[PDB]
Structure 1
Amino acid sequence: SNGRDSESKRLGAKSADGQTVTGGSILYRQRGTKIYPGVNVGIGGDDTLFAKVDGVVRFERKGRDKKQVSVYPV
């Protein structure tokens, strides 16, 4: 019998590229590393990308087929 489902986890990006964010802000929720942590960006125990420092968020491409998030202080 069908009819079951789990609560949506509100994954995805939580901060836009070029946005200023304070240290510790969550930048991306994900299962696995869909996007990798770049400069000044840490990855949590459940693959959540957060900013280690205050700065502007940037989404870049890590090589040919991988994405990445960096936080650049001003």
Structure 2
Amino acid sequence: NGRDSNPKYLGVKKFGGEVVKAGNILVRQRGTKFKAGQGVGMGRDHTLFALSDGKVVFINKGKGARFISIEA
């Protein structure tokens, strides 16, 4: 063994209560650990970036049912 692979510094890049420019990246994820609410659009590797400038808010009933909206 003695093998390993680079860190992928994934996360909630922008936490609810953070104003965001358009195109800011807010969550990094392997998949849909977050499912993108209103105003946000999710990319190829399933990072989801805000489309509209404003505050970031978490809709989060959880269990795969967590969504990131942006409010203007």
TM-score over 0.5 for the pair: yes
Give the number of aligned pairs: 71
CA deviations over 1:34-53 (Å, ceiling 9, x no partner): 11010100000000011001
Between Structure 1 and Structure 2, whose CA radius of gyration is higher?
1
AA aligned to 1:19 is E
Aligned counterparts of 1:64 and 1:4: Cα–Cα separation in 2: 35
RMSD: 1.1
Tell me: CA distance 1:38–1:5, structure 2 relative to 1, closer, same or farther (3 Å): same
2:15 maps to: 16
List structure 1 runs of 4+ shifted beyond 6 angstroms: none
Where do 5+ consecutive residues of structure 1 fail to align?
none
SS at match of 1:33: coil
TM-score (norm 1): 0.89
Tell me: CA distance 1:9–1:54, structure 2 relative to 1, closer, same or farther (3 Å): same
Aligned counterparts of 1:7 and 1:64: Cα–Cα separation in 2: 29
Which residues in structure 2 correspond to 1:1-74 (within 5 Å)? 2-61=1-60, 63=61, 65=63, 66-73=65-72
Where do 5+ consecutive residues of structure 2 fail to align?
none
1:64 CA drift (Å): 5.9
SS at match of 2:35: strand
